Structures are given as structure tokens and as C-alpha cells.
Amino acid sequence: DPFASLAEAYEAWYGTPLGAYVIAEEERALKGLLPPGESLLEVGAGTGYWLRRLPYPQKVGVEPSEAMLAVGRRRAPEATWVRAWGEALPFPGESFDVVLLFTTLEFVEDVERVLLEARRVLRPGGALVVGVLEALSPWAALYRRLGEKGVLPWAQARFLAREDLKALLGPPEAEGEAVFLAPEAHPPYEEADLAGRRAGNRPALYLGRWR
Amino acid sequence: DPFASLAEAYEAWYGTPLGAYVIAEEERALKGLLPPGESLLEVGAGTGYWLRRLPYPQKVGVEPSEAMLAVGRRRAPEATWVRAWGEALPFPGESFDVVLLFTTLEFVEDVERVLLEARRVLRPGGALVVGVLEALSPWAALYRRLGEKGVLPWAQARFLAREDLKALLGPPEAEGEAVFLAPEAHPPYEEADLAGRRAGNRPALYLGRWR
Numbered sequence: 001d002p003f004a005s006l007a008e009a010y011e012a013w014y015g016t017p018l019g020a021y022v023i024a025e026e027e028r029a030l031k032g033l034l035p036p037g038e039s040l041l042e043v044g045a046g047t048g049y050w051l052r053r054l055p056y057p058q059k060v061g062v063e064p065s066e067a068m069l070a071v072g073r074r075r076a077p078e079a080t081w082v083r084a085w086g087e088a089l090p091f092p093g094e095s096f097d098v099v100l101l102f103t104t105l106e107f108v109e110d111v112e113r114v115l116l117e118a119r120r121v122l123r124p125g126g127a128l129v130v131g132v133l134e135a136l137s138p139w140a141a142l143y144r145r146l147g148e149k150g151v152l153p154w155a156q157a158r159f160l161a162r163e164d165l166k167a168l169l170g171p172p173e174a175e176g177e178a179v180f181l182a183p184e185a186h187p188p189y190e191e192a193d194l195a196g197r198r199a200g201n202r203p204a205l206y207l208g209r210w211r
Numbered sequence: 212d213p214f215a216s217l218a219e220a221y222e223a224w225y226g227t228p229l230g231a232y233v234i235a236e237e238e239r240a241l242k243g244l245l246p247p248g249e250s251l252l253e254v255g256a257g258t259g260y261w262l263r264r265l266p267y268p269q270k271v272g273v274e275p276s277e278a279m280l281a282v283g284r285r286r287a288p289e290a291t292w293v294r295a296w297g298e299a300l301p302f303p304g305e306s307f308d309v310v311l312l313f314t315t316l317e318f319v320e321d322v323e324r325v326l327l328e329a330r331r332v333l334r335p336g337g338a339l340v341v342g343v344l345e346a347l348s349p350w351a352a353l354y355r356r357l358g359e360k361g362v363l364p365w366a367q368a369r370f371l372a373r374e375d376l377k378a379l380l381g382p383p384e385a386e387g388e389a390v391f392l393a394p395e396a397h398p399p400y401e402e403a404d405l406a407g408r409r410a411g412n413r414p415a416l417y418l419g420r421w422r
């Protein structure tokens with residue numbers, strides 16, 4: 001478990017200027033894809049960052065890391081926390097309106113399997129929202145380097161491009177993307193961000209919604 | 212040999228609009244860092260793209276790939292082509308005024324030995340000029356992915372950041388940088404480039420000169 005020792009300070013970076021900007025843009029992008037619904041299931045809910053911020057009345061978080069889970073259920077108590085793996089969700093078919101996978105496929109053991117589970121558990125016409133750190137962004141460059149440099153959890157991550165998702169789930173009903181500036185950007189961040197777009201940067205976060 | 216079948220189409224990309232822009236930008240940065248001198252040695256001279264374009268009256272190209280070499284000795288006949296590895300230069304010490312390593316370190320066997328050899332064959336007061344595809348740039352993200360997907364020669368490449376070079380050679384005497392736009396930039400390219408710089412992007416090409 002690469003997250004075994006990262007749980008406690010996992011959100012520390014969001015407090016910094018750049019991190020605050022990144023997390024703000026990502027949430028905004030995510031909100032743009034979130035559909036109406038009653039029940040939500042986040043696979044790899046980690047510290048429950050999204051669980052506590054999403055509005056759905058019925059929220060369920062699946063997290064295999066004991067460390068992450070310890071923090072998550074503390075921070076997002078209103079949700080039901082289940083200790084399981086994406087590859088085998090302990091729920092009957094067609095039980096959720098929305099299933100969220102935010103930068104989790106980068107760490108699962110079997111991507112196709114996790115996606116199958118997500119769709120089974122998803123009810124008719126259910127919305128599957130997937131978010132990944134676009135492999136082609138300068139952020140991926142940083143994380144790939146940090147990974148080989150032995151930094152956790154990056155050393156055990158796999159990187160995906162929107163192309164890979166579309167390859168697996170087909171054409172998304174809707175898309176979203178955020179953070180075009182680079183890791184070493186200087187503020188005012190909005191300038192850096194618009195600049196990164198114009199420079200042709202792939203975004204740091206790609207979001208797709210499939211039914 | 213990763214370049215075993217890339218020699219012929221190697222320079223092809225330089226024909227496209229972005230390619231044209233990129234390579235021209237690299238040439239400008241490289242020439243701006245090249246010092247005064249009579250003799251030049253390029254380790255991993257490949258297809259002689261740089262040998263065919265540098266002022267030095269006496270220049271030698273070291274290239275282990277026979278495939279690349281076949282093209283190089285042809286496109287840059289005014290230079291002496293030697294078939295050897297950077298790990299073992301067939302030259303006595305203090306014999307060159309300038310030694311050039313342009314995107315070669317990412318393919319050699321032993322980086323430290325290559326650099327030791329480069330320094331050995333350098334005359335007193337000589338200058339070593341290294342150019343690498345900065346590992347933190349969006350281009351690095353693209354090649355690491357291509358390498359992952361098999362694509363040669365990227366599957367065999369290692370990537371360096373200017374910090375890696377500083378750790379190996381110490382603080383350079385001078386530096387150069389080029390191409391802040393991303394692989395997917397859109398024309399007008401000069402704007403895209405200025406954008407990438409403001410975005411916080413790391414240059415696709417980092418150049419350093421040591422003595």
C-alpha cells in the first residue's frame with residue numbers, strides 16, 4: 001500500500017497557493033460533469049475529499065487502504081465507508097446513479113476489471129465519471145520523474161491519457177479538463193493557466209462521463 | 212540499436228511547421244552557447260545534423276550506430292566519422308577544443324563514463340556542451356509515453372533534468388534553453404512559445420556549458 005504513510009498529510013498541499021488553485025480548478029471541472037442523482041459511489045475515496053464536498057444525499061466510499069480509510073471516514077462521516085477493492089465491489093448490480101473514479105485508475109491493480117465493476121454496480125443509464133492525470137501533461141512528467149526517483153505513491157502509478165479511457169469506455173457523453181499551467185508556474189495563476197492553454201499543454205486533469 | 216531503422220526518416224519531422232520551428236529554435240540556442248575554437252567532437256553525432264551546421268574548421272563525429280552513421284558520414288562528409296562509443300573514445304587526451312553531447316546522454320550505457328571521456332579528450336581550457344530533453348517538460352511526458360507504448364528509440368531512453376547535469380558536472384559556466392511550447396501547440400508558434408514560458412513550462416531543450 002503506497003498510501004500507507006501519506007494519509008495524514010495527503011491534503012496539505014491543497015493549503016498552498018498553487019495547490020489551492022489546482023484543487024479549486026479540478027473541483028470546478030468536476031462540478032461541470034456531475035449529473036443529477038440520489039446515490040453516489042466513489043471507488044478509491046481515499047481521505048474522502050470529494051465525498052464531503054459532493055451534494056448527493058446518498059454517498060458511499062470504497063477504499064482499500066486502511067490508512068486512507070482511517071482519515072476518510074473521519075472527514076466524511078455522513079457517508080458509508082466500505083473497505084473493498086475496485087476489482088470486487090460488494091454491492092448488487094444496478095444500485096447507484098453515479099460512480100466516481102478520481103485519479104484512482106492510476107493505482108488499481110486491474111483497470112478493465114475496475115471499470116466493469118463500476119458499470120455493473122451502476123444502474124440503467126447510470127453515470128460513470130472518471131478523472132485521470134492526463135499522461136501528456138507536464139504534471140505527468142513531474143510525477144513520472146518523482147516515481148522513478150522512488151517517491152510514493154508515484155513509483156507505483158500508471159499514467160493514462162484521455163485516449164486510453166475512450167479506448168476502454170468508448171466516446172464519453174461529456175468531458176471536462178483542468179489545470180493547464182505547469183508545476184513550476186508563477187502567480188497570478190490565472191495568467192499562467194491561460195498561458196498553458198495557449199502553449200498547447202494537455203491539462204493536468206481530464207474528466208469523462210459515460211452512461 | 213534503437214535507431215536501427217530510424218536513420219532515414221530521422222530528420223523528417225523537421226519538415227513539418229512545428230518541427231521546423233522547434234529545430235530552428237534549438238539551433239539558435241545551441242549556436243548561442245558554442246564557444247571559440249578550432250576542433251569539435253560530437254559524441255553520438257547521428258545523422259550529422261549539427262556537424263553539417265557548425266563553424267569549427269576541424270570536426271569529428273563519434274557514432275556507434277552503423278545505421279545512423281551511414282547517413283551521417285553522407286550528410287556531413289566534411290567531418291571525420293569514427294565508429295565508437297562515448298564510453299571509450301579512440302582519441303588521446305586533450306585533443307578537442309569543444310565536445311558536444313546533444314540528446315545523446317539519454318541513450319548511452321554509462322552516463323558518468325561518457326562524461327569522463329568527454330572531459331579527458333578536452334584540451335586545457337576546453338568546453339563541454341551538453342543538450343538534453345529536459346525531463347520535466349511536456350515533451351518528456353510525450354516521449355516517456357511513446358517509450359511505454361513501445362515506440363523506438365524512446366523505449367530505451369532515460370531522461371535528465373538540468374539538476375541531474377549539475378550534480379554530474381557541477382554548476383555550468385553558461386546555459387541555454389529552447390522550446391517552451393508543448394507538443395500540441397498551435398500556430399503562430401512564437402506566441403505558443405512565450406505562453407509556455409509564462410505557463411511555467413520547462414524547456415524541451417536544456418543546454419549547459421562546462422569547462
Ligand SMILES: Nc1ncnc2c1ncn2[C@@H]1O[C@H](CSCC[C@H](N)C(=O)O)[C@@H](O)[C@H]1O
Nearest residue numbers: 044045046049065085086102104107108109
Ligand atoms: N485496487 C484498488 N481499488 C480501489 N481503490 C484503490 C485501489 N488501489 C488503490 N486505490 C485507492 O485509490 C486512491 C488514489 S488517491 C485519490 C483519492 C480520491 N479519489 C481523491 O482524489 O481525493 C488511494 O486512496 C488508493 O488507496
Ligand SMILES: Nc1ncnc2c1ncn2[C@@H]1O[C@H](CSCC[C@H](N)C(=O)O)[C@@H](O)[C@H]1O
Nearest residue numbers: 255256257260276296297313315318319320
Ligand atoms: N553509448 C553511446 N555512445 C555514443 N553514442 C551513442 C551511444 N548510445 C547511443 N548513441 C547515439 O546517440 C544518438 C542520439 S540521437 C541524437 C543524434 C544527434 N546528436 C542529433 O541531435 O541530431 C543516436 O544516434 C545514438 O546512436
